[PDB]
């Protein structure tokens, strides 16, 4: 069980303040799940302020779907994401 949330990261002057992990065909971050996950959130950064949490599974970035994605596809999505990053996540309870 869990919930889906869409968080909006408002970038400031210190970067997004997250790390992402996982992806199809590489070592799973969590169990045998090959999804993209949030593996780090900087405490003082804008992702923390928006409400993103470690362990959130990343479903979309600015509406671009990442279900079944390889790691580099999520990296590319975040690189292109701009000043306000809308991040749809699944948060296991």
């Amino acid at each position: 069980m869990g919930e889906e949330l869409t968080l909006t990261i408002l970038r400031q002057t210190g970067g997004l303040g997250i790390s992402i992990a996982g992806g199809k065909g590489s070592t799973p971050y969590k169990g045998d799940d090959e999804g993209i996950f949030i593996s780090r959130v900087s405490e003082e950064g804008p992702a923390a302020r928006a409400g993103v949490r470690v362990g959130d599974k990343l479903l979309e970035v600015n509406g671009v779907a990442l279900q079944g994605a390889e790691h580099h596809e999520a990296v590319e999505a975040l690189r292109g994401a701009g000043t306000a990053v809308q991040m749809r996540v699944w948060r296991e309870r």
């Binding site: 210190g14 970067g15 997004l16 303040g17 997250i18 790390s19 992402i20 992990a21 996982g22 992806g23 590489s26 070592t27 971050y29 593996s39 780090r40 900087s42 790691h71 999520a74 990296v75 975040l78």
Partner: peptide, 11 residues
């Protein structure tokens, strides 16, 4: 090709 646990940081 990167292998293992892939983690990419956006500081």
């Amino acid at each position: 090709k990167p292998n293992g646990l892939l983690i990419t940081d956006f500081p």
